[PDB]
Symmetry: C8
Subunit: 65 residues, 8 copies
């Protein structure tokens, strides 16, 4: 499924395909936002790593399974 | 109904169709804004999940039912 | 009457037609700004709801009746 | 007279014609800025109301009397 | 003389002709900046009034007499 | 592997090829972000040095190994 | 010599020719930045005055003498 | 070697050629960032002076020797 992450004051919108479930990704993101984590880590189906600065996240759209 | 969410310092305006009522969406949004929640969660009619950073919300437009 | 709301750091300028009076809208807006409400709610003549983050308001321009 | 109000981080520059005197408008603006008031209110010659968030004001240009 | 005022996060650069001396204008501006005044007032040769929010000033260029 | 670093309020997105492993780079970045370090330092396969102001980091994309 | 001053969140880059020495200009700038002065004042070879809000300075480039 | 300095909320990316070593430049920059100096000073091979407001630095990219 597609994951789109908008980053405040940054022109690119991160987009990738996740091998995880909508719930797994939602948990990871929610926890980061709820806890002001300061780093959110997501991996895509090919093993690319996105390390995002939680505070700079505008939104995450998790696509349909 | 359409839900449009403007996000401060972000080009994209989030748009989707909700299976919920204007009241349900209004409650979710209002609560987030009123309580400075760290996270607002909205789901659309197809089951796409929008996790929005409440503080970055400019506005929400909730369209008319249908 | 037209209501235009400018939102800081957001391209779009919210515009709608109000079934309310200039005074009603002015009170709702003024109260939000004066009290730093954190949410302002306006409804248009068709029943669209605008939930605006008060702090992000640049201006409101309430048209003539 | 023309009143132009520049708003920080907002593309539109508010412009209108005032039925009031340069001094009246200057007092209303000065007071808002000096007191960090939450809200500045100006009306134009046609009765349009501008409610501006004082803190978001960059400048006001007040035109010459008449 | 020309007075140019740059305003941070605002596209227009205020420009006008002053009937005052470079020193008078410099005094008014310097005082505003030094004291964090919260309002700077300048008038031009035709009597236009510029009320600027001191904190939003990037620079003032005062032209030659 | 490619490393892309997005910098908040800066038009350029830093891109380079790393001689290090995804894990090495991830540790260096994670540490910087988790500790709010004042400075993150990365070197590329040609020996170019990137000194990034941690607080200004939007994201790092680490490419797949090789 | 040329002095270029970049101002954060402002399109224009201030440019002028100084009758002073690179050292004089460097001292004035350094002092302002080091001390978080509210105001930096520079004058050019024709007597134009630049009053800059120190906190809004991105950089100063001081050119070579002549 | 080339030194490129990205400045936050400023279009221009400072570029110059250094007569110093990658290590010298790295120390000067690292020290500024680590200590929140409030002024970083770099000089180029022709004697141009860059006085940069440390807090406004996005990145420095020190080229190969």
């Amino acid at each position: 499924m597609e994951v789109k992450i908008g980053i405040t004051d940054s022109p690119r919108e991160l987009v990738f395909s996740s091998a995880q479930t909508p719930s797994e990704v939602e948990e990871l993101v929610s926890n980061a936002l709820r806890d002001d984590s300061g780093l959110l880590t997501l991996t895509d189906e090919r093993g690319r790593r996105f390390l995002i600065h939680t505070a700079r996240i505008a939104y995450v759209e998790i696509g349909v399974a």
